[PDB]
């Protein structure tokens, strides 16, 4: 299903955004990623050869490669959506053709993730503020709110009066996401998940000033939850909790944090500044 976003409720699909000179952005960004993550991108740069892949071209209705994406025009109204759907091909096609558990499939998921992270950053230039002292303090409160969240609290927030009854209000859903799994007990985790991240590490990065801009923090938080979707089967409970936590994080950022910054900004109680270094490097 080409038209079905992997995440139909992602801001990448809901918001009416366009990046100026998008074609230039695409080729720039994809080349950076190819160079940075050579081993995982290498299998997705070119289409599989027609001579040797007959069942692939039987099975797969819309073949896609990074080279094909780089050759296409996306500078028109539905361009952002068509680009993202073409990118998602890279994992949809791979999942259609290969075993779901396979390294190539897990790699396809990480390709798409890394690309969509770069788009989310670029889409949000207008609000990608420098993490100064005030923004840091606010992000720390929202991170703590996420870490302390229980199933009852998250459902109250996301569903309101429609929340299921008697949901647990003790266990923090964040628990298995706090620390990286031990590399000696689970070596395969590190063979599969190429960019490991855990919430204790993100919090420490934020506390000490390692994140320059808001989306630097947001992407490492999303990486935590998305890595759980790469390593685990969708039927796993931890997969479900990663979805729940992602959704809650999105709610906190969009419905609480950003509106709070705007309210404080209007009242003259916060300074919102940028570091625009490389903001339009693609140009």
Q: What is the CATH number of the domain that holds 94?
A: 1.20.920.10
Owning domain of residue 144: 124-268
Per the CB < 8 A criterion, the answer to whether 214 and 139 are in contact is yes
User: Among 93, 123, 153, which residue terminates a domain?
Assistant: 123
Dist CA 7 CA 219 (whole Å):
16
- CA distances for 40 relative to 109, 185, 222, angstroms: 10, 24, 19
Torsion of CA 215, 218, 219, 222, to 10 degrees: -160
Dist CA 174 CA 158 (whole Å):
17
Dist CA 264 CA 270 (whole Å):
6
Per the CB < 8 A criterion, the answer to whether 62 and 90 are in contact is no
Residue position matching structure tokens 């339009």: 280
Residue 241 lies inside a defined structural domain of this protein: yes
Per the CB < 8 A criterion, the answer to whether 155 and 167 are in contact is yes
Which is nearest to 195 in space by CA: 68, 80, 36?
Answer: 36
Residue position matching structure tokens 């909790």: 241
Dist CA 156 CA 36 (whole Å):
41
Strand, helix or coil at 213? strand
Dist CA 166 CA 145 (whole Å):
21
Residue 133 lies inside a defined structural domain of this protein: yes
166 with 97, same domain? Answer: no
Per the CB < 8 A criterion, the answer to whether 138 and 144 are in contact is no
**Residue 130 β-bridge partners:** 213
Dist CA 84 CA 126 (whole Å):
20
Per the CB < 8 A criterion, the answer to whether 102 and 224 are in contact is no
- CA 132 from centroid of its chain's CA atoms: 23
Task: Report how many domains make up the chain.
Answer: 2
Can you give the resolution of this entry in Å? 1.8
24 with 114, same domain? Answer: yes
């Amino acid at each position: 299903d080409y038209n079905a976003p992997l995440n139909p409720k992602s801001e990448l699909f809901l918001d009416d955004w366009h990046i100026p000179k998008f074609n230039r952005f695409i080729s720039f960004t994809l080349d950076v990623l190819i160079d940075k993550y050579k081993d995982i991108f290498k299998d997705f740069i070119k289409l599989p050869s027609r001579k040797f892949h007959p069942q692939y071209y039987y099975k797969i209705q819309q073949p896609m490669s990074i080279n094909e994406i780089k050759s296409r025009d996306y500078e028109y109204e539905d361009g952002p959506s068509n680009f993202l759907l073409d990118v998602e091909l890279l994992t949809k096609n791979c999942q259609a053709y290969n075993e779901y558990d396979s390294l190539i499939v897990k790699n396809s998921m990480q390709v798409v993730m890394l690309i969509e992270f770069e788009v989310l950053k670029a889409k949000n230039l207008k609000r990608n503020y420098l993490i100064n002292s005030e923004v840091k303090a606010k992000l720390l409160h929202y991170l703590n709110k996420l870490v302390d969240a229980t199933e009852k609290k998250i459902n109250q927030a996301l569903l309101g009066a429609s929340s299921p009854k008697n949901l647990d209000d003790k266990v923090k859903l964040s628990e298995p996401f706090m620390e990286l799994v031990d590399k000696d007990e689970l070596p395969e985790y590190y063979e599969i998940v190429h960019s490991p991240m855990a919430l204790s590490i993100v919090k420490q990065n934020l506390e000490i000033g390692q994140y320059s801009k808001i989306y630097d923090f947001i992407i490492d938080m999303l990486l935590v939850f998305q890595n759980a979707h790469i390593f685990n089967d969708p039927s796993a409970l931890i997969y479900k909790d990663a979805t729940t936590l992602t959704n809650y994080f999105n709610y906190l950022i969009q419905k609480e944090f950003f509106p709070e910054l705007q309210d404080l900004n209007e009242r003259g109680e916060i300074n919102l500044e940028f570091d625009k270094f490389e903001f339009e490097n693609y140009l």
